[PDB]
Amino acid sequence: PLALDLDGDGIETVATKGFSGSLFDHNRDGIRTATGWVSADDGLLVRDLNGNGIIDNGAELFGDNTKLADGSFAKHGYAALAELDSNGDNIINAADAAFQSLRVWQDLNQDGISQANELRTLEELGIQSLDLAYKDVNKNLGNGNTLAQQGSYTKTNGTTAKMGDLLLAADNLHSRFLE
Numbered sequence: 001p002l003a004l005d006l007d008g009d010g011i012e013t014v015a016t017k018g019f020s021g022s023l024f025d026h027n028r029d030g031i032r033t034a035t036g037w038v039s040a041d042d043g044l045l046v047r048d049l050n051g052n053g054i055i056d057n058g059a060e061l062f063g064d065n066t067k068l069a070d071g072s073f074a075k076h077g078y079a080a081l082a083e084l085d086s087n088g089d090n091i092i093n094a095a096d097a098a099f100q101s102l103r104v105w106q107d108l109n110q111d112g113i114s115q116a117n118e119l120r121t122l123e124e125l126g127i128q129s130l131d132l133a134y135k136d137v138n139k140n141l142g143n144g145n146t147l148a149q150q151g152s153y154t155k156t157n158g159t160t161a162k163m164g165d166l167l168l169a170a171d172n173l174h175s176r177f178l179e
C-alpha cells in the first residue's frame with residue numbers, strides 16, 4: 001500500500017503483536033508473525049468510498065487490491081493511483097477532481113483500525129502534487145515490511161519528499177485485511 005514520508009527522512013515502520021495486531025499466544029493457538037505499519041511520523045494514502053469518515057474497506061487503501069475503471073484489479077498502488085490523473089500529465093494535483101477526495105491516514109496507535117481524527121487532507125499537510133513516476137527498490141524497512149517501489153511527492157513550498165508502495169507485515173492466516 002502507498003506510504004508517504006511526511007517529515008523528510010524516508011519511509012519507516014513499526015510493529016504490533018497481541019493487542020493492536022497479530023495474536024501470538026501459544027496456549028490459544030501459536031506464535032504468529034507480527035503486524036507491521038508506518039511510523040507515527042509518516043502516513044498512508046487513502047480514499048473514503050462510502051462517506052463514513054473512516055478507512056474500513058479493502059479498496060479504500062491504495063494498493064494491489066484497488067480496482068481499475070473496467071473492474072480489473074491493479075497490479076500495485078501506483079497503478080491504483082494512476083486511475084485518478086484527469087488530464088494525462090502523469091501527476092496527481094489539485095486540478096484533478098480526485099485530489100479533493102484523497103486523504104492521508106496517520107494512525108495514532110498504529111493498529112491500522114481507522115478513526116476519523118486519523119485522516120487528514122492533502123491541503124492541511126501542505127501537499128501540491130504526487131508523482132506517478134517510480135523506480136523499483138525492494139528495500140527492507142524492518143519487522144518484515146518492504147518498500148517495493150519509490151517515487152516522489154511535492155509540497156506547496158516547492159520542496160519534494162519520498163513516497164512508495166510499501167508491503168506491510170502480517171500473519172498468513174489473517175493477512176490483516178480490511179474486513
Ligand SMILES: [Ca+2]
Binds near residue numbers: 005010012041042
Ligand atoms: Ca519519515
Ligand SMILES: [Ca+2]
Binds near residue numbers: 054
Ligand atoms: Ca469507508
Ligand SMILES: [Ca+2]
Binds near residue numbers: 087088089092
Ligand atoms: Ca494531473
Ligand SMILES: [Ca+2]
Binds near residue numbers: 107112114115
Ligand atoms: Ca487507530
